[PDB]
Design a protein around this nucleic acid. Structure first.
Ligand SMILES: [Mg+2]
Ligand SMILES: [Mg+2]
Ligand SMILES: [Mg+2]
Ligand SMILES: [Mg+2]
Ligand SMILES: [Mg+2]
Ligand SMILES: [Mg+2]
Ligand SMILES: [Mg+2]
Ligand SMILES: [Mg+2]
Ligand SMILES: [Mg+2]
Ligand SMILES: [Mg+2]
Ligand SMILES: [Mg+2]
Ligand SMILES: [Mg+2]
Ligand SMILES: [Mg+2]
Ligand SMILES: [Mg+2]
Ligand SMILES: [Mg+2]
Ligand SMILES: [Mg+2]
Ligand SMILES: [Mg+2]
Ligand SMILES: [Mg+2]
Ligand SMILES: [Mg+2]
Ligand SMILES: [Mg+2]
Ligand SMILES: [Mg+2]
Ligand SMILES: [Mg+2]
Ligand SMILES: [Mg+2]
Ligand SMILES: [Mg+2]
Ligand SMILES: [Mg+2]
Ligand SMILES: [Mg+2]
Ligand SMILES: [Mg+2]
Ligand SMILES: [Mg+2]
Ligand SMILES: [Mg+2]
Ligand SMILES: [Mg+2]
Ligand SMILES: [Mg+2]
Ligand SMILES: [Mg+2]
Ligand SMILES: [Mg+2]
Ligand SMILES: [Mg+2]
Ligand SMILES: [Mg+2]
Ligand SMILES: [Mg+2]
Ligand SMILES: [Mg+2]
Ligand SMILES: [Mg+2]
Ligand SMILES: [Mg+2]
Ligand SMILES: [Zn+2]
Ligand SMILES: [Zn+2]
Lengths: 91, 154, 110, 114, 69
RNA sequence: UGGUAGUAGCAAAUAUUCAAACGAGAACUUUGAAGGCCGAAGUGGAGAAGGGUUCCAUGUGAACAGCAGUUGAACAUGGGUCAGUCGGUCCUGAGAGAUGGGCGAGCGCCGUUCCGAAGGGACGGGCGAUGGCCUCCGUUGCCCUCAGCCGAUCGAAAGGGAGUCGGGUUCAGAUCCCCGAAUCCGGAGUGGCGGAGAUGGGCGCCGCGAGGCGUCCAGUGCGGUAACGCGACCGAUCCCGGAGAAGCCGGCGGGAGCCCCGGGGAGAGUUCUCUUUUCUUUGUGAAGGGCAGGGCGCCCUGGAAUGGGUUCGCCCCGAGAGAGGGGCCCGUGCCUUGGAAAGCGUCGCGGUUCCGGCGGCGUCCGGUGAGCUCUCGCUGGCCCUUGAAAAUCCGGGGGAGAGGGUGUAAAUCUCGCGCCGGGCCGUACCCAUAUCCGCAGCAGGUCUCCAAGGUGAACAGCCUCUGGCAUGUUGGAACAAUGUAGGUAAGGGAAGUCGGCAAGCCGGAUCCGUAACUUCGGGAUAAGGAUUGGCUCUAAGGGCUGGCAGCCGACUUAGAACUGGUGCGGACCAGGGGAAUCCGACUGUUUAAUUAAAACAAAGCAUCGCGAAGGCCCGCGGCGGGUGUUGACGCGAUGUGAUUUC
RNA sequence: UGGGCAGGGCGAAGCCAGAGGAAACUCUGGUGGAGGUCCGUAGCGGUCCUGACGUGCGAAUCGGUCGUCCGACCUGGGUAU
């Protein structure tokens, strides 16, 4: 029984804050609350302990990441760029 | 009261039998149990902090040190980073493009943590109500309920 | 005995008088304990127990007697289906062993 | 129904001022103040959230009166580190040294070829 | 307090210097011997009546014996 | 000092009546009876702040308690507060504040680690002196050697903080006094004792053997595959770790206390009729030992799809799931020591009195509950909020060192006992419609703990139990107007009035139904309907034992019949509704004492400054200070104000 | 640095079962209790009667009716300006 049709987790805010604000917060709330797959254990048990801090339920390993996502586009792009820079510099 | 996470890294003191503990600005991609190398000879990867004079141009660093021995004062906010554009072996100075858009010349002996500061994208999520704002600013300082000047008396 | 409990002498909602969550958890406990009693007595196998456990969680059977009657009819139809399969498999084995014996008899001749 | 009062001048339901009900031999319900529940010591591994076993979980200052055998366990790093991390450290300490020996042997072969 | 289950250990406890007094309490279906020491009031619980009076006769003479009731 | 004037008034919170006693005198004191209230968020019982003798007994009724008083919180006489365990004392939080330093004409100010020679300590070794059986050790005096710390010091009677409970006793004090059981800390030449470190193996011999002599060797424990256990089981400077030490909220389960039901007893109420009836009571401390009961992100065997285990929800599983076997923590629950001696309820004797007086008995068996409170445990949700330090204690890595050469063994013991001590300050009472602050016995204000039965969703309102009180600074006699506080009113239904001000209407629950619009979440209890009592039935919703049988236990929902003067959420509790305009998104805050709003604020939006020798700002002064434990996703300075369009 | 906040209404994510479909996925019945959510006590505040009083209980109180009542919530003590 699909309870709503457009609003999802953001429905807890009721008829407040405006539609555009609610739809903009909804995607980030989904991202920050959905559990992700840990790259160290494989279990989908990554939860946002605090702002920018992600924790593994089973691995019990803490990973610094984005405020609302496990890893941002800037972070992964920088990581790839630094890896290539190290390869180019050290041959 | 800080938008960026901290990482407690423990080193072994080379001059006496003890384990020093320090707090660095966390760069996303780092995790507990990871070996972080600090020094001139440390290789270029996310997490390590090495002087600017060694890293090549175009690199991305955080917790930039304004002066040699300053312990890091530049580019240490969530999601912010500094790009190294060019070097100058004579006078040992390197130009760095700060996140505000200005480029500053910096001595090539101070260190910088490689990578971007974790916790980025915080501004993307809109604060939704006075409750979020009140809790955001109560931790930092009493500056939130700003009354506009025109509403005041002369 | 049922007196002094009509619609007139009720000021709270039916949820307040008897919470839905408590009624649901009473039913869940009763059905699940009945299911594991059947499982430990071997009246049902592990796979049927799991499927019934999920279907109970899905709010299919409202009463214990309805649940056990559903179990009884499932066991009856499954047992007959097993009987038909066993007869067919036995007949197939008879045919296969018959041709194998004929083949080995011909080989013994040759 | 017997209603009872505090037996101390502290009249606030703070953490330290927590009581329980006990019936006296005089057929009377009297408040009895109970110490805060102790916790078992945590391992030094830093990864395992389960508290150590075999150690009395009492208030920290109570450990003075306890005997030695009731505070630790008969193991290396016993009473301050779980056996899981202990055996992992033992295996890691052995393996790292073995690889260091292998590396030194490879360096010796490299110098011999050099 | 402590409950002594044997008899010879109770005799040693009674003969100990710390024993200031011993009292005998005989109730229905049980006889108790309470010996007061500096820290503990040890109690011996028995049901054999003739063995109990044998015990009270074998008590050391230097201990203050006090029958109850 | 007069008129006012013997006037205004002595009207907030339902209420008193009768008989007796003391007394000279009684609507007001006391007793007894009756009728009432507060109704367990109290008019009850106890605290913190505050007050300081208001607490207790006797006497007086001069003055006060707005009447009076035989009464007092009034007056005069004398008492009353007993602690190693209850707190302060100890630690530190936000902060405050000296020394160094700097400034200042100057009293002094800034500053709290900064422009400091900031250690009065020590394992151990050496020199020298003293005492005791000068053995060995202790106190030292000197030297070598080792040593980080974060700043002297203050800062909580709600933060951390080891350790006392039960009964009894007074006119007034009881975790303090008496009795009985304990516990923590400190101390110790000869350790006061026991136990551990412990006493074994090899060889040569004697003896029939058991067993006994002489040589070497080992001996800072032992057990189980394991979680780990056993009664101890050496150990420094150093290092690491833990506990102390953590937010709010939801659900669930376990355990206590209270409540409920069926009984046995004991004592009281009714008995014109009935009621194997109704009301009270029916227990065991702290600290140990044992066993239930919960929790484990603890381990061993073995390895799974045809996927499995499982909660109310979840969740978990080749990084090892189900099935067995174990291990650990809490064990506030039950039994036992304590402990029936004591306590309690009854019946009977005594002291004719002064009595922890003496006596008999009983202090019993059971069952359930989305019941309420407390506590424990598990899990989950929320944060652009992440939810405290220190004192103190413990464990672990290390072997610097010590102990004896085979015994009268030793060094060393966090094991069972033994011996002594624990200093100083507060401890009464009030705690609030009369012990506090408001000029007062002032309807104002003042921080918390304990919370029964019925109705009922309910800690709502009403009635009652335990407990307390006399109607709130007076009584009597009438019931005029005008008032204050409640109502009722034929017919019309806002025609009154600036204005439906006020009053009035609906109102709970169950079964139906619910529009314009919209940001799709709402509007919504929209609007509009019907039923509701009492009694008697029926159907359905489970456990325990041995698709079946028996025995139990609870609350509900639906349906039906009968019936009452159509009364039935019968008291209390308890939303009027709709159609549009303007302003403000909303939640929130605002002129204490005339304006609660359209005002302010807020998330959103848009600008400006600043890369630290910097922007904003403070400061008389200083290498001053706040932002800053900060670095452009930051800080500071502005405007506008949800969303959509511009 | 501590303490405190009855009982109900609406029903967000997440999850289960069934039905439909080629898939994407779509529907129905459940569990779940999130919300600077609603009615409403305690508490906090004071809209209206411009009621009562207005030489008062009171140099700002009293009655009914009232707003909010899980958070920008209320409150004690310590401390700073
Ligand atoms: Mg402010
Ligand atoms: Mg103005
Ligand atoms: Mg529901
Ligand atoms: Mg305290
Ligand atoms: Mg142990
Ligand atoms: Mg008059
Ligand atoms: Mg009056
Ligand atoms: Mg009192
Ligand atoms: Mg008095
Ligand atoms: Mg008078
Ligand atoms: Mg004492
Ligand atoms: Mg100063
Ligand atoms: Mg102090
Ligand atoms: Mg304290
Ligand atoms: Mg008890
Ligand atoms: Mg298993
Ligand atoms: Mg008795
Ligand atoms: Mg060692
Ligand atoms: Mg007192
Ligand atoms: Mg009181
Ligand atoms: Mg006063
Ligand atoms: Mg009256
Ligand atoms: Mg009167
Ligand atoms: Mg009065
Ligand atoms: Mg009329
Ligand atoms: Mg009429
Ligand atoms: Mg008109
Ligand atoms: Mg009105
Ligand atoms: Mg409407
Ligand atoms: Mg218009
Ligand atoms: Mg508004
Ligand atoms: Mg204000
Ligand atoms: Mg005003
Ligand atoms: Mg007003
Ligand atoms: Mg502007
Ligand atoms: Mg609300
Ligand atoms: Mg008025
Ligand atoms: Mg007047
Ligand atoms: Mg509301
Ligand atoms: Zn993982
Ligand atoms: Zn571990």
């Amino acid at each position: 029984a699909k309870r709503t049709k457009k609003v999802g987790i953001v429905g807890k805010y009721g008829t407040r804050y405006g539609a555009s604000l609610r739809k903009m917060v909804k995607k980030i709330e989904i991202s920050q609350h959905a559990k992700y797959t840990c790259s160290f254990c494989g279990k989908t048990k990554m939860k946002r302990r605090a702002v920018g801090i992600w924790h593994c339920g089973s691995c019990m390993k803490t990973v610094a990441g984005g405020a609302w996502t496990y890893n941002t586009t800037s972070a992964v792009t920088v990581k790839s760029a630094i890896r290539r820079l190290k390869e180019l510099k050290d041959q | 009261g800080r938008g960026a996470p901290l990482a407690k890294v423990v080193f072994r003191d080379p001059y006496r039998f003890k384990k020093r503990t320090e707090l660095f600005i966390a760069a996303e991609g780092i995790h507990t149990g990871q070996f972080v190398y600090c020094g001139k000879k440390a290789q270029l990867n996310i997490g390590n902090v090495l002087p600017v004079g060694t890293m090549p141009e175009g690199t991305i660093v955080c917790c930039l040190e304004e002066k040699p021995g300053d312990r890091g004062k530049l580019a240490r906010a969530s999601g912010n980073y500094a790009t190294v554009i060019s070097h100058n072996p004579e006078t040992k100075k390197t130009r760095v493009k700060l996140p505000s858009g200005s480029k500053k010349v910096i001595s090539s002996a101070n260190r910088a943590v490689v990578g971007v500061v974790a916790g980025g994208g915080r501004i993307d999520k809109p604060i939704l109500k006075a409750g979020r704002a009140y809790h955001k600013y109560k931790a930092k300082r009493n500056c939130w309920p700003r009354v506009r000047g025109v509403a005041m008396n002369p | 005995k049922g007196r002094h409990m009509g619609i007139g002498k009720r000021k709270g909602t039916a949820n307040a008088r008897m919470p839905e969550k408590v009624t649901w958890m009473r039913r869940m406990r009763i059905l699940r304990r009945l299911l594991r009693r059947y499982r430990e007595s071997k009246k049902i196998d592990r796979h049927m127990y799991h499927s019934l456990y999920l279907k109970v969680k899905g709010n299919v059977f409202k009463n214990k007697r309805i649940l056990m009657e559903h179990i009884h009819k499932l066991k009856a139809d499954k047992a007959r289906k097993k009987l038909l399969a066993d007869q067919a498999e036995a007949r197939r084995s008879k045919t296969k062993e018959a041709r194998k014996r004929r083949e080995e008899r011909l080989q013994a001749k040759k | 129904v017997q209603r009872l009062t505090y037996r101390r001048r502290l009249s606030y339901n703070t953490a330290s001022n927590k009581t329980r009900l006990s019936r006296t031999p005089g057929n009377r319900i009297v408040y009895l103040y109970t110490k805060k529940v102790g916790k078992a010591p945590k391992s030094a591994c830093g990864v395992c959230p389960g508290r150590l076993r075999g150690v009395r979980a009492v208030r920290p200052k109570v450990l003075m009166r306890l005997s030695k055998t009731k505070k630790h366990v008969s193991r290396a790093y016993g009473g301050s580190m779980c056996a899981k991390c202990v055996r992992d450290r033992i295996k890691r300490a052995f393996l790292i040294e073995e690889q260091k020996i292998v590396v030194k042997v490879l360096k010796a072969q490299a110098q011999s070829q050099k | 307090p402590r409950k002594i289950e044997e008899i010879k250990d109770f005799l040693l406890t009674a003969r100990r210097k710390d024993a200031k007094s011993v009292k005998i309490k005989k109730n229905k279906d049980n006889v108790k011997f309470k010996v007061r020491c500096s820290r503990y009031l040890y109690t011996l619980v028995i049901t054999d009546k003739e063995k109990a009076e044998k015990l009270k006769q074998s008590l050391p003479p230097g201990l203050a014996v006090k029958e109850l009731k």
